[PDB]
Amino acid sequence: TVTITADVRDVTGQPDNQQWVFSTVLRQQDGSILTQKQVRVNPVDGALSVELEPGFAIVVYGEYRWFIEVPETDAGLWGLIATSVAVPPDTSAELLADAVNGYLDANPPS
Amino acid sequence: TVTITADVRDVTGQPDNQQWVFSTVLRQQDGSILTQKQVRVNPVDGALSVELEPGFAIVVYGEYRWFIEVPETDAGLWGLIATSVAVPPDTSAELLADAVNGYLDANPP
Amino acid sequence: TVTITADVRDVTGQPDNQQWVFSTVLRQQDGSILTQKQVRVNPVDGALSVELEPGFAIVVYGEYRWFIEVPETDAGLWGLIATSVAVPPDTSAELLADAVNGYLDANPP
Amino acid sequence: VDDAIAVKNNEVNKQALTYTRR
Amino acid sequence: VDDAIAVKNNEVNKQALTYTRR
Amino acid sequence: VDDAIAVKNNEVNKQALTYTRR
Amino acid sequence: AADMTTLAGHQQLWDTVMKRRQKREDERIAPPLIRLWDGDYKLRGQLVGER
Amino acid sequence: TYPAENVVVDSDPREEQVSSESGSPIWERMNSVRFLHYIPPYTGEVTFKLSVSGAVPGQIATLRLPRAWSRPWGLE
Amino acid sequence: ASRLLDPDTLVELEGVNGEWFDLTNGTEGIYLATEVTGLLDPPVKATYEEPGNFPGARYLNHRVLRRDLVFGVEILNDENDETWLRRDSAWRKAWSFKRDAKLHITTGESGHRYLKVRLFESPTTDMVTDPRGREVNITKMVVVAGDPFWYEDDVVYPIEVQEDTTFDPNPLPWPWPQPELPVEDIEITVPNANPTDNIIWPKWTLPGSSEKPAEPYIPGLPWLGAPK
Amino acid sequence: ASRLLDPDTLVELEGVNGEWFDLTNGTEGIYLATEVTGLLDPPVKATYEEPGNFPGARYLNHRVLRRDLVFGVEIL
Amino acid sequence: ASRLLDPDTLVELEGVNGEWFDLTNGTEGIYLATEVTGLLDPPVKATYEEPGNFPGARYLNHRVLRRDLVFGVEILNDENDETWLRRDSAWRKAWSFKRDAKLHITTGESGHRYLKVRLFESPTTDMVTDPRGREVNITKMVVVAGDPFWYE
Amino acid sequence: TTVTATVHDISGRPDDSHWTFSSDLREQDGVIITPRVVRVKPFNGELALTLPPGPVRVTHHQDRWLIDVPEEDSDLWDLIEAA
Amino acid sequence: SHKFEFIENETGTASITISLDHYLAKWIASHKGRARRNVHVSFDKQGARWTGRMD
Amino acid sequence: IFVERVTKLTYEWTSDGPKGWTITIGYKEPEDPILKAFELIQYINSNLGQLGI
Amino acid sequence: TGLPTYPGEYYTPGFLGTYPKAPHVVFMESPYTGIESSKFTYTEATDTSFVLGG
């Protein structure tokens, strides 16, 4: 019982309620056996919240599989995934912004 | 968060209401996770209006596919499309002929 | 817009109401985006009349295809077909002008 | 099917004449 | 077909004993 | 089939109303 | 009777009602008992094996 | 001595909707009121509010929710 | 990418006497064969009506039909009580027309579900030559699930009474004026009331009175004792 | 590992005159031919109803039918 | 003289829960599967009578019927939540007997139109071997539109 | 000889999917132990069962083990990881 | 479908088959709604008018 | 809910088991038109008997 | 206008049946019905005054 949580949207800020899948290898926690059973969680109004047992877990989402160590506290899910997600492909707006700055100012008297 | 807009018409000046399509790669914005969902937007009586989260986005319209950067404040869509095609990331800071002499223009509010 | 017109008849002098097709390449003009929608116009009692936005347009009729430039004031369609260009003009300068004009509209003085 | 019901109807009409006069 | 009409007839002949006696 | 006898039964029931009333 | 204090008694109550549904299912597919009697109402026998 | 009128209520329209441990005809005392409403497909969080009169602490009720899928796998 | 497709799928039958068959690994000498119809969705009848002398049709209703499931089992002919004959006898003993066997399917992606199944036709074996002399025989199964869905175990949530709401029946008019009785309100929150693709009819188990009735019961007479 | 499948299966007909035929050894010149239909289980008519609009069907009856045997005999 | 025929035809399904499938590009792993019956014309019953002894027949009526639409979809068996089992279940979730899905066709020559579509039979894949072990599977679709026209 | 475990998913709820137990044919304490493959289902995520000492095969979905069962009572995980 | 019959000096009959989702079939069904309970039809074609009352 | 009395109960059984029950709730006229003809003939024969008295 | 009351043959263990004071049976024709086929007939009243005698 550690709550792992996130807020999940599409590019328009609208909720995305596609299921997130949690599982593990067989292992023992506090004396009980944890099985490989795939726990499928709906985001509710875009909020994802799941109780997980500490240590190794697998996260699956669409094409993606990531391995996490569920920490012994109450962490946010992007922090556990972030090292395994590719950075958004660099696009030019900062260059154009700089190039259109560097004014010689207008200052009309009207 | 940020609103992007356009007025979209045919060569006869009547509205064209075919869908625009918007998506992004899996990434974090203002705390939240942004997913790969393709969101379909129809212009209404010729007005296109979409809330988009800042940073990288993909715009598909028929054959075309533009990769764009959503600004931190409200904007016209065609400026973001024009930026994406006119300035590839490899543009080498060419400085645009002082933005073509800035077209020699500016006005206060 | 500008009104473009023709009188359309068959070899026996009766009116010929088969459709004419109008389109363009994707571009901005005034405040608006013009789309690649193929707009189909019937002649009415053999009079073809269509309001078009100035600049580049595509005319199609039966087997034929033409690249017209629509002038700034009302004109006969045959004068534009007889003067039609071989291949579309590029938008390279216009896309830079649009990108600069967009970034300026995103943050005025 | 309907023709078989029609044939049986005609035969019943011919047999009803044992029991009726118009 | 004529067999089904014969079955329907035997069922009506039985139900008509509610409404008839010798 | 039972349905064809049932359809013709329903027509005779609507034409019997020429000849009977509650 | 079942213990209404604990889940095991709620399960015993459920399993008692499901048993009663099974007896009603078996009684609905059972044929009538048919008996034949003579003119002075003496029993001749039970009929089983009619078409 | 008979069991008390402990009951199973079943909302399903195909079966006797109220049945007692005693075999008492408690469903005849409903005046033709029926349970009519199912829990729809893909229903998440629901709050069920009951009320009771005439009960003592330590008695429990239960809510029982079937799981019937069109297929051997998938459809989550 | 390069990948062998070797699914996790486990298929087991539990028979009407509680004997078990693994149809995936074949530890009882029995395997599911390469022909299956009637897993996945059950058959549906959809009904439409003509809207009079106008375009199209209108939807009336749809109904899930019984699941007719057709499959074969490959039975290996080995020695002693592992002969084809003995295994085909053991297989036949697992099935009934009156009693449900249950077919279990397990996956990593969805866990475990079962289907309640019976014979619809008698099992068949082709007998071109004496099947005791053949090295494998395929037996053809035509089976029905008259309850056509795939089941998990039914979830039970406990609801606990916490206030004494007992009252004296004797001062009251008949039937009791329920607006002026003592009442406890119990709330229960269920996190996932129905995960499934199908409608769910809830069931409730409710405790009757712990206090003895006011009058004894005489078989053959109406019990007038209800008001008190 | 390696084995011959050679069953001890004996098939005999006793006729309506008490005359016997061994159809395995053909000592009377007659053998059971290939392709027998109707040994093993007898045919059964399972009866189900699908009334109204509830999912699936009810079992009503099953009856063991008349067994038809189709076979041939090879006469030398 | 010489050309490739490469039409701009876009086929999309919008499901009863608002989920979308691009059946031309298969970004959800699903494609329209070769033979399609029923896209291009609604069935019609034209009624004529041949009474007595005149030459020919007399027209009485014609009616546009409900349109049966038979097709299949190719579902690719990839990894993780993109297995055939996840895609064929997601595909099944888009469809209903009671609610209407929308089948959207866009072509440059004539723009965008959509058809309101229902299941008519349960979707089926053949199971010669376990579907999860096959590298692709075809789900057969028998679909009805009781309102038989294509709408803007 | 008594063996127990508590069995859960990664979210700490019960996993009541059936485990499987069997052996080779053998005699222990004067009783013949048969090759029958017993399915045992956890109840509220607990399982408890009796096993004869010496070799037993355990199975859970695709996982297979050959445990060796002691005279004393013991936890099924401690027996499983000893394989 | 519908049918009507005219008979000389004798009672003809008529019938209408209709869908239950039709706004007029709902009005024939709801006797709560008709304060004046009888239902009458007119079929008009080529100057002829069949008229009658629901049995 | 429409309420009235059960006026007719029919049971049928065959070698394939029960066909179930036909229940008439309220006073329906006979479905076969010929049984309505026999029902009117019963009414006449009772009236024709009292007219002879 | 009062709250419904029941015959004392209800409450009794093992009883089933109808008394006219308190009908209970409803054949629901809504979804999941179970009924094989049905005809509902409504017949209007067809007669305003009665003439008698002779």
Closest in O42, O43, O44 to M38, CB measured: O44
In chain O, residues with a C-beta closer than 8 Å to the C-beta of N25 are 27
What is the residue type of H59? Q
Distances (CA, A) of L54 to L2, L31, L48, L66, L74: 13, 14, 18, 10, 13
Q: Record the tokens describing residue I202, joined without a space.
A: 């809830």
**Beta-carbon neighbour count of residue K101 at 10 Å?**
23
User: Quick check: C36 contacting B, CB < 8 Å?
Assistant: yes
DSSP secondary structure of chain I: ---------EEEEE-TTS-EEETTT-TTSEEEEEEEESSSSPPEEEEEE--SSSSS-EEEEEEEPPEEEEEEEEEE--SGGGSHHHHHHHHHHT--SSSPEEEEEEETTTEEEEEEEEESS--EE--SS-GGGSSEEEEEEEEEESS-SEE-PPEEEEEE--S-----STTS-SS--GGGS--EEEEEEES-SB-SSS-B--EEEE---SSPPSS---TTS--TTTT-
Distances (CA, A) of G32 to G24, G35, G45: 15, 10, 14
- Supply the angle between the helices B77-86 and C92-105 in degrees, to the nearest 10: 130
Instruction: Please report where in the chains the tokens 């139109």 appear, as a residue.
Output: K113
Closest in K8, K20, K111 to B40, CB measured: K20
Burial readout M14-42 (b: 16 or more C-beta within 10 A, e: otherwise): beeeeeeeeeeeeeeeeeeeeeeeeeeee
Cα C21 to chain centroid, rounded: 10
The shortest C-alpha distance from H17 to chain O (Å) reads: 12
Cα I30-I31-I33 angle, rounded to 5 deg: 135
Cβ-based neighbours of B99, under 8 Å, separated by 6 or more? A99, A100, C100
The span from the CA of I216 to the CA of I222, in Å, is 11
Cis amide leading into I175 (omega within 30): yes
Q: In what order do the strands lie in the sheet with C39-41?
A: C39-41, C20-23, C55-61, C64-70
The shortest C-alpha distance from J37 to chain N (Å) reads: 25
Touching K: which chains, 3+ CB pairs < 8 A? A, B, C, H, I
Burial class (CB in 10 A: 0-12, 13-18, 19+), D18: exposed
β-pair partners for K74: K31, K138
The span from the CA of O17 to the CA of O21, in Å, is 12
Dihedral pair phi/psi, residue L33, rounded to 5°: -100, 120
The shortest C-alpha distance from J40 to chain G (Å) reads: 27
Contact L61 I10 (CB under 8 A): yes
> Are residues I141 and I71 in contact, defined by beta-carbon separation less than 8 angstroms?
yes
> Are residues I105 and I112 in contact, defined by beta-carbon separation less than 8 angstroms?
yes
Give the three-class secondary structure for K24: coil
The span from the CA of B5 to the CA of B70, in Å, is 12
Count of A-L CB contacts under 8 Å? 49
User: Quick check: L16 contacting A, CB < 8 Å?
Assistant: no
The experimental method, as deposited, was: cryo-EM
**Beta-carbon neighbour count of residue B105 at 10 Å?**
9
The span from the CA of C52 to the CA of C38, in Å, is 13
Burial readout O13-51 (b: 16 or more C-beta within 10 A, e: otherwise): beeeeeeeebebeeebeeebbbeeeeeeeeeeeeeeeee
β-pair partners for I118: I144
> Are residues L3 and L45 in contact, defined by beta-carbon separation less than 8 angstroms?
no
The shortest C-alpha distance from A37 to chain I (Å) reads: 7
In chain N, residues with a C-beta closer than 8 Å to the C-beta of F13 are 31, 33, 36
Resolution (A): 2.8
Per DSSP, K80 falls in state G
> Are residues I113 and I105 in contact, defined by beta-carbon separation less than 8 angstroms?
yes
Contact G14 I205 (CB under 8 A): yes
In chain F, residues with a C-beta closer than 8 Å to the C-beta of N32 are 9
Distances (CA, A) of M43 to H71, I3, O43: 53, 74, 22
> Are residues I166 and I219 in contact, defined by beta-carbon separation less than 8 angstroms?
no
Cβ-based neighbours of B70, under 8 Å, separated by 6 or more? B2, B4, B52, B53, B54, B55, B56, B57, B80
**Beta-carbon neighbour count of residue I149 at 10 Å?**
23
Dmax (CA) of chain B: 45
Nearest to residue I57, comparing CAs of K148, M16, M18, K121?
A: K148
Closest in K83, K127, K145 to I39, CB measured: K127
Cα K84-K86-K91 angle, rounded to 5 deg: 90
Cβ-based neighbours of I124, under 8 Å, separated by 6 or more? I139, I140, J40, J41
